Design a protein around this ligand. Structure first.
Ligand SMILES: Nc1ncnc2c1ncn2[C@@H]1O[C@H](COP(=O)(O)OP(=O)(O)NP(=O)(O)O)[C@@H](O)[C@H]1O
Ligand SMILES: Nc1ncnc2c1ncn2[C@@H]1O[C@H](COP(=O)(O)OP(=O)(O)NP(=O)(O)O)[C@@H](O)[C@H]1O
Ligand SMILES: [Mg+2]
Ligand SMILES: [Mg+2]
Ligand code: NA
Ligand code: NA
Ligand code: NA
Lengths: 297, 290
């Protein structure tokens, strides 16, 4: 018998608005392909009741907290409903910058040099020791929390300052070497790596708008794109991802690629990265979402 | 109001019968400490209904799948009940032996030499080419599926390897081949930020608490166990497992995020040695859920 599919959307996180748009597009795409899909705004319907409502399969179109971080996935494993995107472990681990970095580094995948700090060694030390500690990183630097309130840093007086603003919403902190750019992103769909996209934000960060420019194709030489494609796939399997996702990557002045992050529930607005990548690989939006759904075992 | 507390016990996993005992003990210890606790056999009671039925706090005494793997933790995060033990990420991570290892390795924490192998590599490669991948590890060898002794084999001669890989590629797409260690084995219970006293395990099982180690070795082991526990983002409580080599080096094996709470279990025995009654132990664990 045919599947009843729930498209989860909206939610209660900071990214509710984008998620409303993503879910709306996913919904229209699935109905175009003949899938018996139904929208579910999770602000108002409890995800713990999907099974009672008669659903067979879940398409996850939520973003941020409670959507891509393992918690929803755990609910779905408890109910024994198949769902799109990565499982609990991968979904949660991709939110944790420190441990994502550790997994990659143990495998010898390229990451920007960094130094981790918790609040202990933070308060158990002062600026004359903190600067010697990072000295080997050079300048300038990025200070961010392990799990939004980050800074760029140019010389050694600026450091101490920015460290304390980072502990205002996290307890483990990363101090990374600054990379020149440019920034790229690589969508993965099952095992297929799609065309990369160059991203230029106006300021120093590609943080949380409307000005940001994107380039498809990305302008990389051909040899450069195979390297970035293979690396992306490795980085995605490294964290045990599956179904689909998006790997974020940055070049440095030397031209080498460094891994930043994997996003386990990407935006699916008409203006979003994955659909733009897919259209360039030659897939309609409708085929994209039918495929993601097919990849949910 | 006194907070109403659910001790989750039983479940539907292989570890059910052990879990009924853990939960029965925890139930009795929370009551002795003045806590308004109720046993909840989650085989019979969903867990998605715990908020609706009026519970305020959850003590997890479930073991294995659906208990210590992040799925339960995810449900409780969604219902927003405070609960005992590690969060989603740590509970799930600790069931992935490969990635546990990778994290520890990158922090320079000591683990046994190993090789990891996925099904695609097993398919592509001849038995001899395999023996060649794991040669640098010597013999004997331990073969385990990567996902938490089902499918686990001790391999003494290179010609037993295939059979061991096959038995394990049953249960997982990822398998670990490790260097065997001559022991003995240790376990270090952690309770919040306190490291309790270790226990020597001598299997074929005798448990020794105290462990026999020098003070100076106990300090090393406690510090090492703490770092291994924080490396994986654990909190609340947990049990860390460690082995020695012939030379007395410690190597990390695993962190357990929902340990046994029967009268014959390790954590309770470490607690006893620390000067705690069982009632005190479970009350402390619950205080650490906020
Ligand atoms: N070492 C670095 N050097 C230069 N730019 C960086 C570095 N790390 C991160 N960035 C920039 O900051 C952006 C967002 O940082 P990220 O590493 O995703 O942390 P985050 O807190 O998750 N920010 P957000 O994307 O809002 O989640 C990246 O996409 C880059 O543009
Ligand atoms: N490298 C090793 N050398 C010697 N003994 C080992 C090694 N790895 C595992 N063992 C023994 O096997 C036991 C189980 O190890 P573990 O790494 O937890 O695998 P497992 O499949 O989780 N088995 P269990 O914990 O019983 O589910 C340990 O407690 C050790 O006594
Ligand atoms: Mg980010
Ligand atoms: Mg184990
Ligand atoms: Na994620
Ligand atoms: Na666990
Ligand atoms: Na030595």
């Amino acid at each position: 018998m045919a599947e009843k599919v729930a498209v989860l959307l909206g939610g209660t996180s900071a990214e509710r608005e984008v998620s409303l748009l993503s879910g709306q597009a996913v919904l229209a795409g699935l109905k175009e392909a003949g899938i018996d899909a139904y929208g579910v705004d999770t602000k108002d319907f409890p995800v713990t009741q999907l099974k009672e409502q008669g659903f067979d399969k879940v398409f996850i179109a939520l973003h941020g907290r409670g959507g891509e971080d393992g918690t929803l996935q755990g609910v779905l494993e408890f109910l024994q409903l198949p769902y799109t995107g990565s499982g609990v472990m991968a979904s949660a681990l991709t939110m944790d910058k420190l441990r994502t970095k550790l997994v990659w580094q143990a495998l010898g995948l390229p990451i920007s040099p960094y130094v981790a700090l918790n609040r202990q060694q933070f308060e158990t030390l002062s600026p004359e020791e903190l600067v010697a500690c990072v000295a080997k990183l050079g300048l300038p630097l990025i200070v961010k929390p392990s799990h939004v309130g980050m800074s760029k840093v140019d010389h050694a007086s600026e450091l101490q300052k920015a460290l304390v603003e980072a502990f205002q919403h996290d307890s483990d902190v990363l101090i990374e070497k600054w990379l020149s750019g440019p920034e790229f992103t690589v969508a993965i769909l099952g095992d297929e790596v799609l065309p990369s996209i160059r991203i230029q934000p106006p300021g120093v960060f590609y943080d949380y708008s409307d000005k940001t420019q994107y380039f498809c194709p990305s302008g990389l030489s051909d040899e450069s794109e195979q390297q970035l494609a293979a690396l992306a796939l490795q980085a995605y399997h490294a964290l045990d991802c599956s179904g689909w996702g998006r790997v974020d990557v940055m070049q440095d002045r030397d031209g080498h690629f460094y891994l930043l992050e994997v996003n386990t529930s990407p935006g699916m607005t008409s203006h979003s990265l994955v659909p733009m990548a897919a259209r360039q690989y030659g897939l309609s939006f409708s085929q994209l979402v039918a495929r993601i759904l097919m990849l949910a075992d």
